[PDB]
Amino acid sequence: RSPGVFFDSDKGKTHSSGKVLYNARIIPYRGSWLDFEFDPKDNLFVRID
DNA sequence: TACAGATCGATTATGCCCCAATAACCACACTCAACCCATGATGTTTTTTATAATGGGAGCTGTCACGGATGCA
């Protein structure tokens, strides 16, 4: 997978609602990784590694 | 005149003293280990060092996706 920024989605992970949870992803060539995530309550969350 | 026997003289038997090997039984012996006791060379362990030194992450891990509990807040 090439270094850069990629965006993804979820297809039925949250069975309670069935919403689509988009997320962003930063993967450098070397170094720590950065992720941006949504929630069913529509809130932004981050994750490192 | 025809027909008999009769003793010299030879192969066969049977046994054993020796004896030229036969075997067990007893006598004395050197050489080669085996273990030990040192001498010493090699090995192994302990001790100390006084300018000053005062908080790593070591390479993460790279990302699957079910279910069943589960411990909370």
Side-chain angles (χ1 to χ4, degrees):
Chain A
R1 274 91 171 211
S2 168
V5 55
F6 312 129
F7 309 92
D8 259 334
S9 76
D10 255 1
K11 307 302 184 64
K13 138 47 75 180
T14 194
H15 39 273
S16 65
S17 82
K19 271 214 312 162
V20 174
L21 301 186
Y22 308 92
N23 50 357
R25 208 154 199 174
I26 303 284
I27 39 183
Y29 194 45
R30 59 173 184 84
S32 173
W33 287 9
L34 208 154
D35 310 323
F36 290 112
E37 266 167 24
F38 266 93
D39 256 5
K41 291 214 333 168
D42 284 302
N43 313 316
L44 259 199
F45 291 80
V46 311
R47 284 170 92 122
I48 290 104
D49 307 324

